[PDB]
Amino acid sequence: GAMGSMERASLIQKAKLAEQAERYEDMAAFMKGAVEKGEELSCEERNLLSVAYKNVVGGQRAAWRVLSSIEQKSGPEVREYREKVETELQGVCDTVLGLLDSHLIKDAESRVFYLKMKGDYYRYLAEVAKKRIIDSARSAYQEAMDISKKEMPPTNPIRLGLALNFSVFHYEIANSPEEAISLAKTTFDEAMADLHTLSEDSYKDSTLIMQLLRDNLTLWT
Amino acid sequence: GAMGSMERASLIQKAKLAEQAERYEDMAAFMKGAVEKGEELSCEERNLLSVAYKNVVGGQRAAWRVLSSIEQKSGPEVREYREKVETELQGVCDTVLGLLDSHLIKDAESRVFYLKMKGDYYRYLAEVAKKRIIDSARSAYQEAMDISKKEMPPTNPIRLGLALNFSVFHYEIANSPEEAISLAKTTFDEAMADLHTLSEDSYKDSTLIMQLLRDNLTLWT
Amino acid sequence: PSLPX
Amino acid sequence: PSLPX
Ligand SMILES: *N1CCC[C@H]1C(c1ccccc1)c1ccccc1
Ligand SMILES: *N1CCC[C@H]1C(c1ccccc1)c1ccccc1
Ligand SMILES: [Ca+2]
Ligand SMILES: [Ca+2]
Ligand SMILES: [Cl-]
Numbered sequence A, B: 001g002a003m004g005s006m007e008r009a010s011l012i013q014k015a016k017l018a019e020q021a022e023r024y025e026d027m028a029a030f031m032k033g034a035v036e037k038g039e040e041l042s043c044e045e046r047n048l049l050s051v052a053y054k055n056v057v058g059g060q061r062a063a064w065r066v067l068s069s070i071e072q073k074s075g076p077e078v079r080e081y082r083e084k085v086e087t088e089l090q091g092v093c094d095t096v097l098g099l100l101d102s103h104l105i106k107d108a109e110s111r112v113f114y115l116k117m118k119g120d121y122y123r124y125l126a127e128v129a130k131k132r133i134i135d136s137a138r139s140a141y142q143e144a145m146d147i148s149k150k151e152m153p154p155t156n157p158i159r160l161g162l163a164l165n166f167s168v169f170h171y172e173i174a175n176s177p178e179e180a181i182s183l184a185k186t187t188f189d190e191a192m193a194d195l196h197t198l199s200e201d202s203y204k205d206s207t208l209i210m211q212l213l214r215d216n217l218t219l220w221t
Numbered sequence C, D: 001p002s003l004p005x
């Protein structure tokens, strides 16, 4: 590995510097090297891995949507460049899914965290695809839902975030707005019903995500 | 070249798509390929080359300043990563200067345009260096000034932009605030004195840059 | 409109 | 505070 000679702690340190510098490609490479040391990631380290790669693919997805939009309005130049960006985007998704399967997927919260990630990056592959991909995303999301409902409180931010992204999967990908609405409403309603389970160290993230669930419900209705 | 098999017109077309997608690395690679076809760049194409590479190094410079600031406040991790970003930044500057010397530097406006670019990217190398670099920047800026004063009107945006960046060179690099102020004031005062030379196809850029000259004068005094 | 980060 | 673009 390109990061094989660097100590794990230095890779984490440099991932944090790259974040401060908004160098998310470097940040993703440092975290990949840390994962490849073979040790589990702490909560803080999981977030760094998520922040790093989600920013990389985010920029690629935004670029792909622009080029795809230009392509629909319509020489081979637009298609060719859209394909170039598409292939690069698929490469990053394959890298993340490879890390998840090879190192990270094996604590309920951590298991849900990584299964949510797998559903996200299969969802990103489905946006440009197929169905062999969507069923992989659903299977990952669904398994993550099963664990979170049994093991984590209804206000837990990982549980809430999983349901939000899973509901987006139902709406945008599966074209199933009914399942997207019921899930988002059930998630929000069950968080409010057991609002007392908010945690002192994560309530800001819980309330943030609860509001984002409400925002999507407002749009979808 | 990586772009050797692609037609010049398709490279220009894809540079414009990359700009729309904010894919400035791709945009810079496409324009480099266009330059390497050996034909002169039009006014529109010159701006694409400038937009592309200035955005690439801009992000690298911003990252370098963040890491350098962290380094001054202070393990070898910060220095090492700052050096990594520094080396990458120097690579892009060497690429641009290579294009300028090998293909582009040989119309008064175009000659000033490319000599201004050379001064900029030597200035960027001087920010991280030396003096063998600063004298190269000054020599490029000064030669560009000589041409613009003889060949171009005082409101011309390339002439104005050259003087603004050259004044910044005097202030931030050479630590010569007196030359920076007199040049910025002379440039602005001579633009106002001959304000009637504004061109129908570029007056928006002229007035924009005149205001930026005034803004810097306000700060420097 | 997925999870921001 | 150089030329923006
Ligand atoms: N974006 C930044 C932190 C991780 C990510 C989400 C998230 C990832 C995995 C599971 C649940 C949520 C996020 C977004 C906002 C607030 C907290 C977490
Ligand atoms: N930034 C975008 C267009 C080129 C560049 C400058 C500039 C480059 C070379 C010579 C003079 C100016 C610029 C900035 C604002 C408006 C016009 C040009
Ligand atoms: Ca209750
Ligand atoms: Ca006059
Ligand atoms: Cl292409």
Ligand SMILES: [Cl-]
Pocket: A014, B080, B081, B084
């Ligand atoms: Cl490094």
Ligand code: NA
Pocket: A004, A005, A006
């Ligand atoms: Na090793």
Ligand code: NA
Pocket: B004, B005, B006
């Ligand atoms: Na060729």
